[PDB]
Every structure is written in C-alpha cells, then in structure tokens.
C-alpha cells in the first residue's frame, strides 16, 4: 500500500483565494507595494534633492505592504497543509 | 482525476471519520473536532475556509459527493524520507548524523506515545545496522522507505 507516503503538496501557492478576506488583503497590500515602490523610486532617483523624511515614510509603508503579502502567503501554506492533513486522514482508508 | 469503484467505497468509510454525528454532512464544528484530535488548532476562519473550498452548492457543509469529488483531485502521493530524517535529527544532540542506541531507547520510552522496552529492542535491532551501538538515522530511514 501507501506505507509511509503522504499527499503531495502543490508546488506553488495557488489556493484559498475564495476566502474573500485573503483576496481583499492581497489586492490592497499588492497595490500598496506598487504605490510605495514607485514613491520610493521617485523620491530617491527622480528628484533633484532627496527628502529623507519622505523616504522614511514610504519605506515604512513599503515594508508593511511587503510583509502583509508574506503573511497571506504563509496563511495559504498553512491552509494547504491543513487540507492535506484531512486528505491524508481519508487516504488511511485505502489500506 | 479518476477514482476506481474500489476507491469510492473505501472513501465512504473515510467520510465517517469526519461526519461524526453521521447526519450525512461535514460541518465546521466537526472538522474542528477532527483537526484537534490530530493535534492541530485551526481557527474558526480556517475551518470555514476548509468547508468553503469544497462546498460546491454553498449550503455551508460538505456532503459525500463534494467530499469524494475533491479527493479525486488529491490522489498524488510522495515519499516521506526527508521529513522522517528530519524528525530523527531532532534527537541528534551533536549534529553528527548519529544517535546512540542508549539515547534512542531513552527517547522512545519517554517522549510521545512511547514504546515498550521490548518494542525498542526490536527497533534498535533493525536500526543499528553496523552493530556498533550507534544509529546512522539517514541510513535507517533509507532502509525503512526503500
Ligand atoms: C477531506 C477534506 C479535504 C479538504 C477539505 C475538507 C475535507 Br473533509 N477542504 C479542502 O480544501 C480539502 N482539500 O484541499
Ligand atoms: Ca455531520
Ligand atoms: Ca454542500
């Protein structure tokens, strides 16, 4: 039988965006990554003189959006392994 | 995604592991009970997500049809050799790839659900391949997963 094998995880995060809360979180945080990447780039590369207070503000908003996206991705991995737990339990009846 | 007729009947028994009251449907409350009996701690939102990902008709629970249809997409398995080797590594105090027979007996008779001293005797007999009182757990795991 299956012996020590377990359900193969999907190689890439791709699930549970039906959650709506996760989907809203990704949309807003990703848009903010785009916003703050642009505003940091503009304020460090497209200005005559760098306004460091402005750069600090957008670096703060940049890191919060990046880490928000990390948090969603880790929650997707958690959900995916919870679901694989249930699949593995059901598959014990194939023995 | 194809299930044999034999797999369909076996997954009917599987559905009963989840459908705890037997009323034909899996609720969030039942999945919480099942998940905690497996030593996990899903939040309410995580349980609702598990239901909602499989609930095709949106009535809030999972019926055997929805249960079976999603098992069909999840039949692929993969070997566990590396994860098992990593569980052994927890007890490799010096990170040298070895665990003594004495330390393995101590672990197995004190941690987890435990084994009897007789059961540990049988395990060490297989695990100590070279007879040197030391378990090369990579090689032991490779033997058991061969
Ligand atoms: C056995 C079982 C499997 C799954 C689930 C609920 C049950 Br029960 N919800 C899921 O997303 C899933 N697999 O991906
Ligand atoms: Ca039920
Ligand atoms: Ca349903």
CATH number at residue A18: 1.10.287.70
Q: How many domains are contained in chain A?
A: 1
d(CA B101, CA B112) in angstroms, rounded, equals: 18
Residue B13: HSE in the Cβ half-sphere, 13 Å Cα cutoff? 10
C-alpha pair distances (Å), A25 with each of A28, B9, B74: 5, 40, 27
Asked if residue A76 lies in contact with residue A13, where contact means CB atoms within 8 angstroms, the answer is yes
Q: Name the DSSP class of B94.
A: T
End-to-end, the C-alpha distance of chain A in Å comes to 6
Angle at B77 between CA B74 and CA B82, to 5 degrees: 135
Question: Which residue from B53, B78, B144 is facing A16, i.e. has the nearest CB?
Answer: B53
Asked if residue B94 lies in contact with residue B103, where contact means CB atoms within 8 angstroms, the answer is no
The whole domain housing A39 covers 1-95
Tell me how the structure was determined. Answer: X-ray
Residue B50: CB partners within 8 Å, gap ≥ 6? A79, A82, A83, A86, B28, B31, B42
Positive or negative, the CA dihedral B26, A91, B71, A71 is positive
Contacts of A76 in chain B (CB under 8 A): none
Resolution of the deposited coordinates, in angstroms? 1.9
Asked if residue B132 lies in contact with residue B93, where contact means CB atoms within 8 angstroms, the answer is no
Residue holding tokens 């459908």?
B19
Could you list the residues of B known to form a binding site for Ca(2+), using ranges.
19, 21, 23, 25, 30, 55, 57, 59, 61, 66, 92, 94, 96, 98, 103, 128, 130, 132, 134, 139
Contacts of B49 in chain A (CB under 8 A): 16, 18-19, 79
d(CA A57, CA A40) in angstroms, rounded, equals: 9
Question: Which residue from B52, B71, B79 is facing A18, i.e. has the nearest CB?
Answer: B52
d(CA A66, CA B5) in angstroms, rounded, equals: 47
Residue B56: CB partners within 8 Å, gap ≥ 6? B65, B66, B69
Could you list the residues of B known to form a binding site, using ranges.
19, 21, 23, 25, 30, 55, 57, 59, 61, 66, 92, 94, 96, 98, 103, 128, 130, 132, 134, 139
| Token duo for residue A93 | 């009846």
C-alpha pair distances (Å), B49 with each of A19, B71, B89: 6, 17, 34
DSSP string, B23-48: SSEE-HHHHHHHHHHTT----HHHHH
Ramachandran angles phi, psi of A6, nearest 5° = -135, 165
CATH number at residue B33: 1.10.238.10
Question: Which residue from B38, B42, B45 is facing A89, i.e. has the nearest CB?
Answer: B38
d(CA B85, CA A60) in angstroms, rounded, equals: 41
The whole domain housing B9 covers 5-73
């Amino acid at each position: 039988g299956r012996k020590l094998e377990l359900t193969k995880a999907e190689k890439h995060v791709h699930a549970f965006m039906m959650d709506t809360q996760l989907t809203k979180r990704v949309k807003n945080a990703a848009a903010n990554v785009l916003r703050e990447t642009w505003l940091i780039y503009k304020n460090t590369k497209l200005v005559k003189k760098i306004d460091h207070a402005k750069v600090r503000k957008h670096q703060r908003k940049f890191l919060q959006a990046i880490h928000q996206l990390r948090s969603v991705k880790m929650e997707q991995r958690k959900l995916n392994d919870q679901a694989n737990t249930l699949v593995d339990l059901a598959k014990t009846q194939l023995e | 995604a194809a299930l044999t007729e034999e797999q369909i009947a076996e997954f009917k028994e599987a559905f009963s592991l989840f459908d705890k009251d037997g009323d034909g449907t899996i609720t969030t409350k039942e999945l919480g009970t099942v998940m905690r009996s497996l030593g996990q701690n899903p939040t309410e939102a995580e349980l609702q997500d598990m239901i909602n990902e499989v609930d095709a008709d949106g009535n809030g629970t999972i019926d055997f049809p929805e249960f079976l249809t999603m098992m069909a997409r999840k039949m692929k398995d993969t070997d566990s050799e590396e994860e098992i080797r990593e569980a052994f590594r927890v007890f490799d105090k010096d990170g040298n790839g070895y665990i003594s027979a004495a330390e393995l007996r101590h672990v197995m008779t004190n941690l987890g659900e435990k084994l009897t001293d007789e059961e540990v005797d049988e395990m060490i007999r297989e695990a100590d391949i070279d007879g040197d009182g030391q378990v090369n757990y990579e090689e032991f795991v490779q033997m058991m997963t061969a």
